[PDB]
Structure 1
């Protein structure tokens, strides 16, 4: 689990969105595994606006942060789960590293701020849903 809180927005993995998230839906994209909901309290997280390909991610299954190199956001094939059939997930960034299904929502950060959140994993690869292109999160 995990979320990004910026302004009056809460950003979570779409497959983990709650009833309150859907009842206060702002925007969602199944092809990206992203959902943004509105909040009453103000959020103070900083979203990165960059092309970084290095950063650090939180892995709850190891209670550890790992430094990683990751690919630029792209369309990648993702095998079926109880949440989605087999499809291409867009705006996804891959890195070599550990993950478990419960690690979704862990934040990936660079010196500029929040890059994205853990969304996929398999075969020793971990994928992050990018949020750097969502310029509207900052107003």
Structure 2
């Protein structure tokens, strides 16, 4: 589990969105596994605006932050899970690292701020949903 809290937005994995998220919806994209809901309180996370390919992610199944090298956001065939069929997930970045399904929502960050959230993994890979192109997270 886990979210990004930027301004009056909450950024979660679409597959982990709550009823309250859906009832307060700003934007959702199944192909990206992203959903954004509105919040009453202002958040403290800042979004990175950059093409960093190194950073650090949180792994809940190890209670550890790991430094990683990751690919640029791409279209990647990801295997079926209990939440999606085997499909092309867009704006996805891959790294070598430990993940389990419940690690979804852990933050990936670089020197500039938050880069994305855990979305996929297995066999010593972890996939992150990028948010650096969502410039509207920084306004209104």
TM-score, length-scaled by structure 1: 0.99
What is the count of residue pairs matched by the alignment? 139
SS of 2:8's equivalent? strand
The CA deviation string for residues 42-93 of structure 1, in whole angstroms up to 9 with x for no partner, is 1121000000000000000000000000000000011111111110000000
**Secondary structure of the residue that 2:7 maps to in structure 1?**
strand
* Structure with more of its chain in strand, by fraction: 1
Q: Distance in 2 between matches of 1:121 and 1:82?
A: 13
Q: Which runs of 5+ in 2 are unaligned?
A: none
Task: Give the Cα separation in 1 of the matches to 2:10 and 2:125.
Answer: 26
> How many angstroms apart in 1 are the aligned matches of 2:119 and 2:132?
15
TM-score, scaled to structure 2:
0.98
CA distance in 2, matches of 1:70, 1:76: 13
Give the Cα separation in 2 of the matches to 1:108 and 1:85. 25
Per-residue CA shift, 1:79-136, capped at 9, x if unaligned? 1111111100000000011000010000000010000000000221100000000000
State the distance in 2 between where 1:4 and 1:84 align.
22
Q: CA RMSD in A?
A: 0.6
**Structure 2: how far apart are the matches of 1:96 and 1:36?**
27
- Deviation per CA, 1:1-39: give whole Å up to 9, x if none: 000001110000000000000000000000000000000
Q: Equivalents in 2 of 1:126, 1:109: separation in Å?
A: 14
What runs of 5+ residues in structure 1 fail to find an aligned partner?
none
Q: Which 4+ runs in 1 deviate beyond 4 A?
A: none
